[PDB]
Amino acid sequence: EDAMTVLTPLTEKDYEGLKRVLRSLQAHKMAWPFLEPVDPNDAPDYYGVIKEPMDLATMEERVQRRYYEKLTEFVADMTKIFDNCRYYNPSDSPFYQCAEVLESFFVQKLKGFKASRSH
Ligand SMILES: Nc1nonc1N1CCCCC1
């Protein structure tokens, strides 16, 4: 990550961009596994093996409350969603597949956000 990402405090204009990025991911066809916290009734062992769970509704709550002070912190929460999924699930599962697709989409949108910040 460059100078600006780590170091620049997030402004109110930055927050309008982050809201737009998050809504784009929530609208993606392969975001369904990540929209809400993992239901433990679907996997009674999940919260024993994943120590820092994350999901897009938790991220939306945090954006609304202005939790994030730097872009790096927002990126770290988003990356946790995809890394948790690839550690819990095998590489041939549809959940793993969805993480691969959605992370590539996030990277495209994040590059767009960074470009709009700089000019
Ligand atoms: N929603 C998910 N995203 O990644 N992995 C997920 N799981 C939900 C189904 C049982 C536990 C694993």
Distance between the termini: 18 Å
Q: CATH fold name, please?
A: Histone Acetyltransferase, Chain A
Fraction of residues in β-strands:
under 5%
Order of helices and strands: HHHHHH
Biggest sheet layout? none
Tally of helical runs = 6
Report the C-alpha radius of gyration, rounded: 15 Å
User: What is the architecture at the second tier of CATH?
Assistant: Up-down Bundle
Counted beta strands: 0
Look at the structure and name the CATH superfamily: Bromodomain-like
Query: Could you say which overall geometry the principal axes of the C-alpha atoms support?
Result: globular
Number of domains: 1
Helix content: 55-70%
Domain Bromo: 9-113
Subcellular location: Cytoplasm; Nucleus
Family: Belongs to the PBTF family.
Protein name: Nucleosome-remodeling factor subunit BPTF
Quick take:
The protein is mainly alpha-helical. It has a single domain, classed as Bromodomain-like (Histone Acetyltransferase, Chain A, Up-down Bundle), CATH 1.20.920. The chain is 65% helix and 0% strand.
